[PDB]
Symmetry: C2
């Protein structure tokens, strides 16, 4: 209902945590558990190869159907461009139902 694809057996969920580094433990014994730790974190590179299938327009629509294109005029900040601050955004949302496929 949020559009997209559904699967009876969808790609899994990836879960991670940082190894519990128990801080300095008491010299003498204690029955309780350890709460003290060392604030730490990590980084890394996320790789995700998504293969894709497609069906291209084979229609004989004689007239030039409509396409999607950035407006060909001159604007201050280019679309999907990075504002002079690196922070970039998206000018507008985009759909797929563009190619005029005969019903």
């Amino acid at each position: 209902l949020m559009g997209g694809f559904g699967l009876k057996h969808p790609p899994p969920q990836i879960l991670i945590k940082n190894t519990p580094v128990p801080a300095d433990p008491p010299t003498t014994f204690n029955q309780s558990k350890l709460n003290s730790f060392i604030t730490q974190y990590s980084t890394g590179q996320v790789s995700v190869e998504i293969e894709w299938e497609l069906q291209k327009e084979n229609s004989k629509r004689w007239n030039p159907e409509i396409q999607y294109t950035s407006n060909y005029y001159k604007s201050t900040s280019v679309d999907f461009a990075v504002n002079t601050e690196g922070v970039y955004s998206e000018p507008r949302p985009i759909g797929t139902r563009y190619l005029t496929r005969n019903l």
Copy 2:
């Protein structure tokens, strides 16, 4: 200078004519030539297979470059459409230099 392609050995020129059908010739001899004929013509189907080579955009232009598309609004007579009289025309001229190729 009219844009396009030039060739030192371009596709030939095709020339045709109707067979000279000499009308009723004089019963007795005449030195001169024949001018009388029968007004006639012919028709047929023109076939022309043009094979083509192309180079597609492989650019990593992150932003959506510009494309050419019929204006997505509502007009009285669709572009390149046949007016209600079969006689159709072209709304506007079209060029190629559209894809933003890095210089």
